[PDB]
Scaffold this active site. Structure first.
Site, short mmCIF file in Angstrom:
data_model
loop_
_atom_site.label_atom_id
_atom_site.label_comp_id
_atom_site.label_asym_id
_atom_site.label_seq_id
_atom_site.Cartn_x
_atom_site.Cartn_y
_atom_site.Cartn_z
CB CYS A 102 -31.47 -29.50 0.93
SG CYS A 102 -33.29 -29.65 1.07
CB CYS A 148 15.59 -19.69 -2.33
SG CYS A 148 16.97 -20.69 -1.74
CB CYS A 190 20.14 -17.93 -3.41
SG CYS A 190 18.58 -18.34 -4.24
CB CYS A 216 16.57 -23.14 -4.72
SG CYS A 216 16.95 -21.50 -5.43
CB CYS A 275 20.30 -23.10 -4.26
SG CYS A 275 20.41 -21.57 -3.29
CG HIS A 323 -31.23 -29.93 6.28
ND1 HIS A 323 -31.81 -30.24 5.07
CD2 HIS A 323 -31.89 -28.84 6.75
CE1 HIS A 323 -32.79 -29.39 4.81
NE2 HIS A 323 -32.86 -28.53 5.82
S1 LIG Z 1 -34.40 -28.22 0.12
C1 LIG Z 1 -34.17 -26.50 -0.09
N1 LIG Z 1 -34.98 -25.62 -0.78
C2 LIG Z 1 -34.64 -24.26 -0.90
N2 LIG Z 1 -35.36 -23.34 -1.56
N3 LIG Z 1 -33.53 -23.73 -0.34
C3 LIG Z 1 -32.71 -24.53 0.34
N4 LIG Z 1 -31.60 -24.15 0.94
C4 LIG Z 1 -31.12 -25.29 1.48
N5 LIG Z 1 -31.94 -26.34 1.26
C5 LIG Z 1 -32.95 -25.88 0.52
ZN LIG Z 2 18.29 -20.59 -3.66
#
Ligand SMILES: */[SH]=c1/[nH]c(N)nc2[nH]cnc12
Ligand SMILES: [Zn+2]
Ligand SMILES: [Cl-]
Ligand SMILES: [Cl-]
Ligand SMILES: [Cl-]
Ligand SMILES: [Cl-]
Ligand SMILES: [Cl-]
Ligand code: NA
Ligand code: NA
Ligand code: NA
Ligand code: NA
Ligand code: NA
Lengths: 76, 327
Positions: free
Chosen positions: B13, B153, B156, B204, B207, B285
């Site tokens: 996903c 710096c 300077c 620097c 420097c 997820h």
């Molecule tokens: S598993 C999955 N499928 C789609 N079309 N879009 C997603 N966005 C986050 N996960 C999915």
């Molecule tokens: Zn300097």
């Protein structure tokens, strides 16, 4: 070089990184500051989620770029 | 009509929610219906063409069904999990994470492919053309914007500016709320002046040492379609949990002018779709609420069931992704 991470509640943190640093290394660096397990972290830059096994250079990430930290809402 | 449900294939996903949001993204839908992707498709074997093909076929089937038909996205799912193996199983997944990998896949398959002297706006324009010569597609046409990040710096006064493309914004949720937390409160928390000090002091370059700095986002280019992802996650270093705060978002006249780098009459949005999650961080997820591009009416898309709904039923605390279109 330094990059930034916009974290979960409003704050930003600063990371010291190299271009060759792996995404796993970056995640470890974030864990050291935030206490979030690397396997739970997702890092977004320029619309891409950064993948383990790749490096900052792989993604053209430059100094002072910002990474966006997000976690997960698992659903079916 | 476009009121076909999607079969649940086993905890899918999350995928169906996103598919329905995209089905109701007018310009993306039309791209598929009018078959405009055909001439954009890349040639060469195992350049993941089947992903675009199966996605477009699904959108076509949805928009040619009788209401309450159930469509199977089984062929599509085969293609997305080949593109992005994390979606191989039948496990529960994050809809945002799915969106990012899906749009990346589609984009890749129809892709048509220092500055300290410059004022801020010109630097941004140049960074933007540099980006569009790598990433240039109909998918980008819809979703891509540009952030400006200014880092000052405090010692300077030197302000370094950089420009980051974005395909969506992930917004921290306000803990406050006078009467209610609003979407504007969340956009403010995103664009606010972030203090970088203590452990977070940047170095620097002028420097030549670590200094307290202030960092601020503004929106340099707005996208046609603005996807806003609410960071519904707690800061627990033990057991992370879902933040279920009600966020009041508008259906109409979301004016984001104040967050712009430069004043604009063309940053006003209307809502057209919402992906909802009900559950905890570990399970739950997904459903979708979507406004038909044709009729302007809202429906709930839930576990293959498609049902009419009022606009007054659209705002709920289960909102997780909001899909806004340039009005
Ligand atoms: S598993 C999955 N499928 C789609 N079309 N879009 C997603 N966005 C986050 N996960 C999915
Ligand atoms: Zn300097
Ligand atoms: Cl934070
Ligand atoms: Cl590394
Ligand atoms: Cl990840
Ligand atoms: Cl082929
Ligand atoms: Cl929870
Ligand atoms: Na990108
Ligand atoms: Na910056
Ligand atoms: Na081949
Ligand atoms: Na900067
Ligand atoms: Na956490």
């Amino acid at each position: 070089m330094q990059i930034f991470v916009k974290t979960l509640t409003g704050k930003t943190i600063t990371l010291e990184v190299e271009p060759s640093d792996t995404i796993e290394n970056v995640k470890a660096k974030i864990q050291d500051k935030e206490g979030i397990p690397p396997d739970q972290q997702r890092l977004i830059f320029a619309g891409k989620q950064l993948e383990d096994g790749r490096t900052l250079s792989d993604y053209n990430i430059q100094k002072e770029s910002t990474l966006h930290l997000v976690l997960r809402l698992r659903g079916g | 009509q476009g009121l076909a449900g999607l079969r649940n294939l086993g905890n899918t996903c999350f995928m169906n929610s996103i598919l329905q949001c995209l089905s109701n993204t007018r310009e993306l839908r039309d791209y598929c219906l009018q078959r405009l992707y055909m001439r954009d498709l890349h040639h060469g074997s195992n350049a993941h063409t089947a992903l675009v093909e199966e996605f477009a076929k699904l959108i076509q089937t949805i928009w040619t069904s009788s209401p309450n038909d159930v469509v199977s996205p089984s062929e599509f799912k085969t293609q997305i999990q080949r593109y992005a193996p994390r979606f191989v199983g039948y496990n529960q997944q994050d809809a945002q994470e799915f969106l990012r990998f899906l749009l990346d896949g589609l984009h890749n398959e129809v892709n048509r492919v220092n500055l300290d002297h410059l004022p801020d706006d010109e630097k941004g324009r140049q960074m933007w053309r540099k980006y569009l010569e790598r990433e240039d597609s109909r998918i980008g046409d819809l979703f891509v914007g540009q952030l400006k990040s200014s880092l000052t710096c405090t010692d300077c006064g030197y302000c370094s500016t950089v420009f980051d493309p974005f395909w969506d914004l992930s917004l921290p949720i306000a803990k406050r709320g006078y009467p209610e937390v609003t979407l504007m409160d969340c956009m403010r928390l995103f664009t606010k002046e972030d203090v970088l000090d203590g452990d977070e002091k940047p170095t620097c370059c002028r420097c030549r040492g670590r200094k307290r700095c202030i960092k601020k986002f503004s929106i340099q280019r707005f996208p046609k379609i603005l996807v806003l992802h609410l960071k519904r996650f707690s800061e627990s270093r033990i057991r992370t949990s879902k933040l279920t705060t009600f966020v009041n978002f508008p259906l109409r006249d979301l004016d984001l002018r104040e967050f712009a780098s430069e004043n604009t009459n063309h940053a006003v949005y209307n809502l057209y779709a919402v992906s909802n999650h009900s559950g905890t961080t570990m399970g739950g997820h997904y459903t979708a609420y979507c406004r038909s591009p044709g009729t302007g009416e809202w429906h709930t898309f839930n576990d293959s069931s498609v049902t009419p709904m009022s606009s007054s039923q659209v705002r709920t605390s289960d909102a997780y992704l909001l899909f806004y279109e340039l009005a």
